[PDB]
């Protein structure tokens, strides 16, 4: 387990099957936001997207994936996007963390507690709208048609702690969610356990 | 039988998951087109949503549906459309069909056979796209999530000789196919029981 937790996704096969269904309970109104997570990635891809929250209007309405030696930050829309280079690989326990504001359109990333990337001027203003689903280790497509599901986008890997911050979380609270004791460090939007998380194909907890 | 028809489907109420899923031959790519049908009208509502074919990025691409005592039909989007006044019925098989045409943006409806409203510099030079799902009995909408087809969009009733053509149909034809003799003409597009119908949500097939 990453830091101290006792549990964490065990996703052992990715297939046309694996994927996962997550119902919160609060709204998403978010004009700014921060998000510390724990990820061991087995294979990492061009594209490999780990979650995606989208709207019927858009599905890219926020999503991050790895590119090859590199991290990808999807905001609004695929148009608009960070990235930072050659930091996450195959098989290791990594804190990923970011922000984002509307103001002036700041967003930043942040790793282990450590800064990663950082901008303005970006989704100036954008406020995230409701009605779209958040999904984890899947994008769009089949589900129950004897498979379906891309096996290129899914995943394969460990992960625990899944977690939303309703605002922006400074820099002091980052790096502690990057240390060793940031497994009892959860948001509000979203808590691990706190938040209703519905495995399915193949993503198994390791309780 | 009415139309000489051999076969129908029974929509016995309007419900959230009432549907059919249709899945044409061949690309809906057309510029000049038309289409006839019976229906027995059995509920009237404010707005009964007959069918509804909607593209990701269009929702409205093509829509007929049925108001208290008007036939509005929708070409490409809510801005363009074809309405009937006092000539729809309830609880009687009738006939609706109409044409359209990007040329000149011709467009027209067939109310027994017989011309309902036109239209000129509809549309012109639209093409329908292709591609997308041709739902009917109900404006698209979830189904498997339990529910979704919001009841004022679903309709009931029973519904035989669905037929769709890749041209502008003559008056004679409309004609033939608004008489007893109109089963056998059925659409190269979509013929019936050619085209695999699945009535599905409380829907049956009848004859």
């Given at each position: 387990l990453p830091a101290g937790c006792e549990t964490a996704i065990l996703f052992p096969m990715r297939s046309k099957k694996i994927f996962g269904s997550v119902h919160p309970?609060?709204?998403?109104?978010?004009e700014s936001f921060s998000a510390c997570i724990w990820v061991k990635a087995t294979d990492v891809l061009n594209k490999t997207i780990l979650f995606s929250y989208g709207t019927k209007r858009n599905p890219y309405e926020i999503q991050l994936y790895l590119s090859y030696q590199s991290i990808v930050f999807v905001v609004g829309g695929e148009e608009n996007k960070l990235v930072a280079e050659a930091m996450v690989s195959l098989g290791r326990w990594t804190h990923l963390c970011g922000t984002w504001n509307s103001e002036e359109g700041l967003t930043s990333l942040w790793v282990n507690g450590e800064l990663a990337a950082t901008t303005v001027?970006?989704?100036?203003?954008h406020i995230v709208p409701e009605g779209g689903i958040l999904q984890i280790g899947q994008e769009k497509n089949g589900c129950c048609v004897g498979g379906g599901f891309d096996e290129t986008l899914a995943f394969s890997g460990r992960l625990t702690g899944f977690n939303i911050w309703d605002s922006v979380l400074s820099n002091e609270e980052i790096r502690e969610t990057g240390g060793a004791e940031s497994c009892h460090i959860r948001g509000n939007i979203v808590g691990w356990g706190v938040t209703e998380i519905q495995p399915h194909g193949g993503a198994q907890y390791v309780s």
């Amino acid at each position: 387990l990453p830091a101290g937790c006792e549990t964490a996704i065990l996703f052992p096969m990715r297939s046309k099957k694996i994927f996962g269904s997550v119902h919160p309970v609060r709204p998403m109104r978010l004009e700014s936001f921060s998000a510390c997570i724990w990820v061991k990635a087995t294979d990492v891809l061009n594209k490999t997207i780990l979650f995606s929250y989208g709207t019927k209007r858009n599905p890219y309405e926020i999503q991050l994936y790895l590119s090859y030696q590199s991290i990808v930050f999807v905001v609004g829309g695929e148009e608009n996007k960070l990235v930072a280079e050659a930091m996450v690989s195959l098989g290791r326990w990594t804190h990923l963390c970011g922000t984002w504001n509307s103001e002036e359109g700041l967003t930043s990333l942040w790793v282990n507690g450590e800064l990663a990337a950082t901008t303005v001027e970006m989704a100036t203003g954008h406020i995230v709208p409701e009605g779209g689903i958040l999904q984890i280790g899947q994008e769009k497509n089949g589900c129950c048609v004897g498979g379906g599901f891309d096996e290129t986008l899914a995943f394969s890997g460990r992960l625990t702690g899944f977690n939303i911050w309703d605002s922006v979380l400074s820099n002091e609270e980052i790096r502690e969610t990057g240390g060793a004791e940031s497994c009892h460090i959860r948001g509000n939007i979203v808590g691990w356990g706190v938040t209703e998380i519905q495995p399915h194909g193949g993503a198994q907890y390791v309780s």
